[PDB]
Symmetry: D2
Subunit: 481 residues, 4 copies
């Protein structure tokens, strides 16, 4: 009927427009209550039980805050109530496409299960949004509140995934370009999605968040840069932006790429792979889908959530025994053992095509220690992690426009040397974790010897614990001594 | 083997003894990751996604804090490392018995589904603890860390459920105070409450007024009637009254939220309609229903909030009735709130009369033009007992205190000795009425029946009475 | 000029209109940086170092929030930018009149020092506001931003102190009545001043605040009640309002009336009394004022802050030796010793005129025990504390109007039985603390005997520690056994 | 033995040993209630009203936490109750020496006022501690609780200031070396003083703190490194340590070196300099001291707090008119105007002795543009700020010892390459702020031209707003285009 107030622990009392309420009260959206924001992280950080549902409300709310604040400071932008609603909707709905365990699904599982396809949760969101609209008679309700469904549905989808291919967008013209920089910012990565998860994940994880989004909003203006209207930050605030990405990096290093969290994700992925053939999910017209193919039909995908984990865990079907056994090993905490961590040196970069060949390389190393057990390629997992500021090797701050107190409509650029000598020199790196599937004390000892040898052989960094875990191997490498 | 560190958002970095790690890393305990602390509340408070698992770690940690602090202030108590471990274990394990959606399971579902049994999550915890111990070879590991399994397993169980003349056999009278930590039957002041106040507030987005750390610093053990009891400092009496006021606030704002409760009611109804067709494998391959898994711990292990999604995602036409109710939850087609009232004077509605109340509302005769006529089954009447944890009694009368000038001398404090601004009564009842018929005309009619029923039973005027039923409220002179 | 942004720990980033900046950047306002919010409380709660300055910004900000939210929900109220500014100004400025150590000055010191006058910090605020306006050329600046100084200065003053004398206000007409319910609510005590201090004092004290003002604002509406437009709360929210006053009461019982905090306030007051003759403060035209008379000249009052404490403490003048000695006893923590606490029973009420006669009564009690020392009236302090819900014996919730979801413009009333049986029966009480100026073990023992006897004699409540501190006295009273 | 409980907003309920209570309840310690932690910062961050008093309790408490935790994990260290008390006392007392406005006094005022002396607040603390002990009969009370005053007073002083000149300490032997790494860590800068201020300043400022000290403590162990027992961190925690110093840097950049906060500190310092001749503070035997000389007599220093600001501000003495006028300009917010900010490039490092010559350099620049006014050296302030990780150009993490999960008693080292490529390359930098004493629009315009020219001339970084504030000057420098 009218506006709903929702009490969120992060944002406090949030107003929801009745149109958003209608979008929210659908199985496509409610689905998000059953997908953990951080997947395997919950198995390391016991506070991190939060789901995509609450994150989505926060992204929607923040999207609305930014656009509304821009509108109030700059009425010359001609931001309408219609524009605000579409930005809120895009904010709510950009998480619709997440599969079970969020980033494990599109980052680990689908690449292994369906190598030939290229899938992202963003594509999923678009498809799921379409399904949500059509299955719930949303278009009449959009019209009722002054939206024009054809243009606006397009606008929403473009905000989530980018150009559906000179001005490449068809939902809004160039004079509203800045509206595409709110929910998902392809230019520099500063968007409201990040802002909600920094705050939300920190609150649940028990880490403290150093970024203040409210301050960013108060200092945000729209200015012309190269004949486009873009969201600009106040020049003074440049330090806070570098801090925002440092914060992003901290969350990744401490929580999202936690070495045990990642191994749990790997084990859950492995169980899904072994379960994939025997789990069936009913989609459109009674047709059946696998976990790995539910991404092709939105009706099936609706019913694809973290419940899959428990479906496997509680199953009696002997065909699911292999999948079920892996998950039971998670419950007993018989996890694959962390062997160590290393990095490439200088400009050495490990390509995506070489990932499969790395367990073989570790097993082929010839450490000079007496070993009771001999280990093979399949006993090792090598997890290559790309740690960056969101834009590969590029500095995202070079893609931010700024303004000064004295000329608020004049956009400017700020280079890294203009800010601080204490900032990072590089903006992308790689971490290599090694784990061993053999969990006894003797195998783990052996694994450590192979690993440290492989590091020496590839001229990678000395593992931090190198002298402790492999005292007979580390002296051969002069660079480490 | 040394300590594992867990980072909890409420308590920060918590150390876990390797024995507790072993108890935690079992399917019986890990199960608790899949049971929401506040069940249906998550459908009202979007922050309230937290599970019993994390609550359990917190209860364990706090239990350890209290016993350890008592030990350090009073070494004459002779609290051993053994005693601390058993109190921590009891703290961890007192939530083992919770079913799907926590309090809805033992408070709504089992009473309706299995009226002949008397079941509490506490009994469940004892049974589940036994199963956890036996299924995971914990006894050898208890011995390894200096526990004596026979005495100590008993001690742990007694802390969770109470006594199975000094009624306890896990510890003697000289250690009586150890039974006042995890679950305090005497006055309700225990560590389980302290963790949930803090945890639920952090997730719900309300702020918690109670400071447990301050209570611990002012806690002492003193002799009262030949028993050693945990006493509070006399000055702190105001904070204790505040602690129960806080408990009451959490209940009124969150745990008994009118929509949260209706969602709990709907989920319970779906479980009832699903109970015949969901099967859970227990011991030796035997099959159990949702309502009977409480009789076999192996089945109960696999009984979590996943039941909700099992029903919701099912295709079996036998589950259509249950599935339809849950789909109505997703679409937010909920039973509509009609209004709320209370009994007056000493009037107390007994548990046996709950069933007869929808009939009473439908039988009321409001003197107005009604487009629809409504029947008993169209109404839900939810009776809620709001109290300070001890029925009509004041829990502060069951707290012993001490003074700065005589720290070993226990005393009592009466309510007039504290404040005239305190509550006169310590128990009350709320009656919510809802309508299963959701259209505008039915809701209008429902409100007329309801306000009439209030007048007829001499209950309190509903707050919105003049707005929802302007033609009914003038008949009652006491209301104006 | 545009807005200045202030980062407050309680409210986050606050915007200040350039007019408010001008009012703030004056010695009359800046003065408030040197007056502690909680006076003597800082000597008990080490976090409570905050000053009236920051509290004032918060009251101003919140005043603006409430009026602005009302305006946005109900444009039919015709709240202008002019109205918002005046409410913000009244919010900023309602603390201008506070003397050194806030409530101790108007609550303890002036009543003792100048019994014939009736002074309140609110009157002080009006006078100080007038002085601020005139001394800083504010009127031209008010005109610049669309205010009409004659009407508006009046409006501001009326918000702070009430009618300067049928509609009794002359700053605004009946159709804007609700604007008088924001900064200082004479009707029920629900105002923004309280809201800032609950939040601010809790944050500094290390108590946690259970009241959510943001939620109140979202549920606040203006409705007609008895031909007046009043701020109404949503019916559901009634529980939270009772809780708001319970919270107020908790803050008083734990912090503002802490037994040691109050004795420190008593000692500081006593030092000020002994110093009052010899401290001189320059006012208008070089004229000299005492601490107790600076309230008569705003120029002197400007220079009257917590610095008075340190002026006395650091003085060398032998005439200030008496005052200086008391303050040195505070530093050494040689405080008057707490003897005990009691309350009147039934309808017994101790009147303000009888406070002086109470130490005599305690000393005149006849305990019938062996006493090494005999104590006199001047050895005892009796502190009478009025604890209420803000409106004497009355329930403030009976003076709150409500509305329902189904009829948002229709005001209603809610009686106490309509809410809960667990609520307080009485809404005012008195606490009596007794202290002894003699600090040795024997005097303290004797003092406790006199005190417990006096309780018995006056038929007051049994002191909590009665059986411990006076085991020979408590058995005579059958009501206590 | 009764412990006293203090409720701190940061740490919650803190127990104080009766000996610490005795040290606290003295004028030498209580003095700290009247010195603001962040001096001038309060004039920018209105929450930052907190004083050194509360900070000191926190440092004491944390010192006790660390030593106590080390004792419980490693009883082989033989940490006694005596050792814990001395570490707590050192923690309490390391802030005793702070003057009015904390770091402004030792960082700005004394260097200008007394160039011939080398004074630090740490030396002040030692002297003040000595005075506190002797003036309050603390030595007998130390003996009562098992301390041996001669050895232990030495130990406490050494913890605060370092060696009072092969093992350089005489309070404790090499086997207790780690006890010197708690209150003030000269080796790497990881100490409990930092931990309390990160938490405390953030809580008051309204910034959020990303460092978790409790986690550091749980991962801290004592291990042998080069025949010394040192506090070691877990190898995994190395990232958190880099983050700790990044956090320190953030606090400095956002708050402690805020451009307005620093100008207020400069103005207060200037007023103190002009007041120094005419303010008298009574010390030992009735002798009189100036603000700049009270550091030579502890009895005078006791009475030297932020009250000096208000003494000057409220004075009528015409000799204080110059000092009083500057402070009145603070109240009216007629502050020296920020012109801009720059940094040195390459290896250029501006020495402390050259600070005085910089305003001359700026005024001597020849921008050659239409200028209504000509500005002189005395019209400019140049503030040089050293931003570092606590150890000049060195990486503090190279001076941290670590241990591994697999060998907890074996200390190791970790190089920067072994951690992350995303870390800083340099660990020290300089910021140069320029301000103008002339506040009109025309002078400010001129000042900006001189400034940007001076940047070009010295080959410093382009000011961020350079193209806006000086569009005719920035094109001459090719490196900036
Ligand atoms: N007292 C409270 N304090 C904090 N949050 C609350 C409180 N009551 C409810 N909430 C939460 C639960 C929801 O997230 C949100 C709205 O709940 P509430 O205002 O009770 O809505 P409702 O939908 O039951 O009221 P309405 O009767 O207007 O429909 O705030
Ligand atoms: N940097 C961090 N800050 C806060 N919490 C963290 C951080 N890293 C991990 N945690 C959380 C996750 C866990 O609940 C808890 C323990 O994690 P961590 O110390 O990484 O254990 P671990 O078992 O992986 O390490 P170990 O190698 O010592 O076994 O702390
Ligand atoms: N990085 C930060 N994070 C949080 N609060 C900050 C930060 N920097 C400054 N503050 C606080 C201090 C002030 O109270 C408020 C505004 O400061 P700031 O924006 O630096 O104002 P200013 O007047 O110095 O800037 P300008 O006039 O250049 O816009 O924010
Ligand atoms: N209810 C409360 N909650 C939180 N902090 C409190 C409360 N009451 C007092 N405090 C604070 C103020 C002090 O910092 C600290 C100690 O207070 P309190 O225990 O009242 O000391 P006290 O010394 O007056 O008691 P006594 O001498 O009677 O033991 O805690
Ligand atoms: Mg581990
Ligand atoms: Mg400014
Ligand atoms: Na362990
Ligand atoms: Na309980
Ligand atoms: Na009252």
């Amino acid at each position: 009927d009218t506006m709903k107030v929702i009490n969120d622990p992060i944002h406090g009392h949030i107003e929801l427009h009745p149109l958003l309420v209608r979008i929210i009260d659908t199985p496509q959206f409610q689905r998000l209550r059953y997908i953990k924001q951080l997947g395997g992280g919950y198995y390391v950080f016991p506070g991190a039980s939060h789901n995509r549902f609450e994150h989505s409300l926060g992204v929607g709310y923040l999207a609305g805050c930014l656009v509304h604040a821009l509108g109030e400071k700059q009425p010359e932008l001609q931001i309408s109530e219609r524009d605000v609603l579409c930005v809120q909707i895009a904010g709510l709905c950009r998480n619709l496409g997440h599969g079970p365990f969020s980033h494990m699904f599109d980052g680990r599982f689908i690449p292994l299960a369906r190598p030939e396809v290229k899938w992202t949760h963003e594509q999923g969101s678009v498809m799921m949004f379409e399904h949500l609209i059509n299955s719930n008679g949303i278009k009449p309700v959009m019209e009722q509140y002054g939206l024009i469904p054809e243009e606006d549905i397009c606008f929403i989808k473009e905000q989530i995934v980018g150009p559906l291919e000179l001005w490449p967008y068809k939902g809004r013209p160039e004079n509203k370009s800045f509206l595409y920089e709110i929910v998902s910012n392809k230019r520099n990565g500063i968007d409201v999605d990040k802002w909600d998860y920094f705050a939300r994940d920190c609150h649940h994880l028990g880490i403290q968040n150093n970024f203040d989004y409210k301050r960013f909003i108060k200092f945000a203006r729209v200015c012309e840069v190269d004949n486009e209207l873009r969201i600009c930050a106040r020049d003074k605030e440049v330090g806070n932006l570098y801090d925002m990405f440092h914060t992003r990096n901290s969350l990744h290093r401490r929580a999202y790429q936690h070495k045990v969290g990642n191994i749990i994700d790997t084990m859950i992925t492995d169980a899904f792979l072994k379960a994939d053939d025997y789990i069936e999910i009913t989609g459109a017209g009674g047709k059946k889908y696998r976990i790995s193919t539910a991404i092709d039909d939105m009706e099936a995908y609706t019913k694809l959530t973290d419940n899959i984990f428990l479906e496997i865990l509680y199953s009696t079907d002997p065909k699911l025994k292999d999948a079920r056994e892996i998950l039971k090993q998670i419950e007993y905490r018989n996890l694959f053992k962390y062997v160590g961590e290393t990095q490439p040196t200088g400009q050495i970069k490990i390509k995506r095509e070489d990932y499969e060949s790395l367990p073989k390389e570790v097993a082929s190393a010839k450490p000079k220690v007496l070993l009771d057990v001999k280990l093979k390629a399949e006993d090792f997992i090598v997890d290559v992690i790309n740690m960056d500021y969101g834009m590969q090797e590029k500095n995202p701050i070079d893609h931010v426009s700024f303004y000064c107190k004295t000329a608020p409509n004049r956009a400017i650029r700020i280079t890294k040397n203009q800010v601080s000598q204490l900032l990072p020199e590089k903006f992308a790196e790689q971490l290599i974790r090694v784990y061993c599937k053999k969990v006894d004390r003797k195998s783990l000892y052996a694994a450590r010897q192979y690993f440290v040898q492989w590091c020496a052989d590839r001229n990678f960094t000395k593992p931090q614990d190198g002298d402790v875990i492999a005292p007979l191997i580390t002296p051969q490498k002069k660079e480490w001594n």
